[PDB]
Amino acid sequence: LQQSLELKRKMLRDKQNKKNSGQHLPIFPAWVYERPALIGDFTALPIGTLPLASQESAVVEDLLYVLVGVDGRYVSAQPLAGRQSRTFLVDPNLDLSIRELVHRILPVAASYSAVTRFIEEKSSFEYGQVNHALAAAMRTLVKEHLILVSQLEQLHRQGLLSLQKLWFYIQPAMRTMDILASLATSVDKGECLGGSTLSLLHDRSFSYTGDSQAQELCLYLTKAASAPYFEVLEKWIYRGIIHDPYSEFMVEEHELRKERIQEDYNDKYWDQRYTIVQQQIPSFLQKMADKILSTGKYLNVVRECGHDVTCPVAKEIIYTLKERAYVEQIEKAFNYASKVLLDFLMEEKELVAHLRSIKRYFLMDQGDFFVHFMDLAEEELRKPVEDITPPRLEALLELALRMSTANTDPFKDDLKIDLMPHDLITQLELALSGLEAFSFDYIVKWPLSLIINRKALTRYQMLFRHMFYCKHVERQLCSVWISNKQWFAGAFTLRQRMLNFVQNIQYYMMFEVMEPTWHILEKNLKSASNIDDVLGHHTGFLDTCLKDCMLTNPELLKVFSKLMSVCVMFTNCMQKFTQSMKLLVSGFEATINKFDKNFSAHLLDLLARLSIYSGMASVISRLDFNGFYTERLERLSAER
Amino acid sequence: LDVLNKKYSLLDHMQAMRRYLLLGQGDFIRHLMDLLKPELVRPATTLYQHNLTGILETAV
Known about the structure:
Chain A: Belongs to the TUBGCP family. Chain A: This is Gamma-tubulin complex component 2. Chain A: One of its GO terms (cellular component) is ciliary basal body. Chain A: It is found in: Cytoplasm, Cytoskeleton, Microtubule organizing center, Centrosome. This is part of a larger assembly, with chains A and B. Chain A is mainly α. Chain A is about 60% helix and about 5% strand. Chain A contains 21 helices and six strands. In chain A, α8 packs antiparallel against α9 (about 215-240) and α17 runs parallel beside α20. Chain A is elongated. Chain B has helices spanning about 1-5, 10-20, 25-35, 35-40, 50-60. The two termini of chain B are about 30 Å apart. The interface of A and B includes residues 614, 615 and 617 of A.
């Protein structure tokens, strides 16, 4: 009427917005909707004075037009004509015996015209590919209604029709029209298009299983309607390319090169580049919903790195009632995409040597690189901020890399040097540079960005920076030891104790986390089968190494921070005493007593906070293996 | 039947409960009570569970 014309243009605007190559999408001309002569539903004297057996002939003739649309002569197609419905008006001056039978024959006309309007309306471009094929399978059944009434007319012209015969003829085909009109009102009422009216068809096919009159009707219409849908599925499953002329598909492409390029911190392919609509699934493909997206998205992220891929085989196969061979095809194609991408990733731009060269520096395989670096670095590191210059560190990187033997792995060539300017507070300053914060940077490419992103590298650096303080405080204490090739006897046991503690902490994290969990990752990555398995192995690996180390604590071990503070105080002041005396027994001894007090307090407190953690009790076991400082206080408790 | 006697172990895992949980092999219980003699004869209500599990791990 008038309200139909709106809906069309709103949907057109949505489809113009979806594609950036589908522009100026067509509509059919305006006269198509202006003229009412497209649908199948485009003299008289008082019937009261006619004899009965002439009235009967006249009403058979008028009714026969009305079955297939076009109005009768004593029956009028009504002008009020509510929404997607038709009414008809028989005349109440018709003889009541005949008229009551006409009432019983009338439902198929109202179940004709409402069907015919839906065929014109939902076949144009603005209701999508599936609605066209649905209407093209209903027009076939309109045609046979015309077929039947023409042969009944040929019998009627030869004086060979009555109302009884006609009624008896029309009883089977009224049921068909009833089912078709119920489907058409259901498609229109929900504003269904795309897969929302293949969900409806999927349901209606299951609904009729005590009929086979209406079940075959709906099943033929489902087989007809899934033929445009399976083309869209062919495009998305077998290619990373879709043409998608009218968008009604569960996956949509909304572009996400507008935020990232050269590297995706977003992991945009799994997020929002190609994303699914859960309302446009046909309500049986929900089981396969993720696998569909992954199958073609994998082909994209290998055609993004310039490596050709192909489908294993292509099928076109239509819907079958309750029975699915395309489900098997979803599995086969998803497996082909995952297997070829997995084989490509481990040979071309291999991640194995990439990960080995990440273990070598942050989780630290060689100490040799670092023992050269620290001695050639320390005097520059000890100085505050703004005294650094990046070429000194760059020269130090290249000299320490080439002078050590870490110059034979391939991926060391994008390695840079940086610092962490908010140092330990970040876990849930830049006032110094090299006393706070030392780290490295490595930039990633697209096949190694969707596994190792920015966040994982920053977490690697935050592990390394924590280990850096132990690595640094250790050689401070060692230099103080070699500076004694008077002294206080408590100073020797304090030096020995601090050194043994920090060395044991380093050893414990090293041969509990770094070697054993790497052994686990080495067996995980030989048993991945898709890029959600390599993602699972890497994120479980990183979460395990973060949690297993002493990094994660509810308060980040304030005992440990204050402990390292008094260790750098000890190494400074003892060495300062030795340099001044070379150029008494109560000036040295008082500071040694204060340091021993603070270190014993923090050591007792960490052992107490380690016993509440509760295998995992081996850290207490190794740290005080000999049975001294294994428990020096029973742990005081309240009097309440 | 076939998936529980091949791909899972039901019978073989059932035998071990006979051997230990029902105390049906006395060698295991003899060496367990033998090595863990002082810790058992003393109140273990004043001793934590984690030590007993750790020493079971090597005792088995």
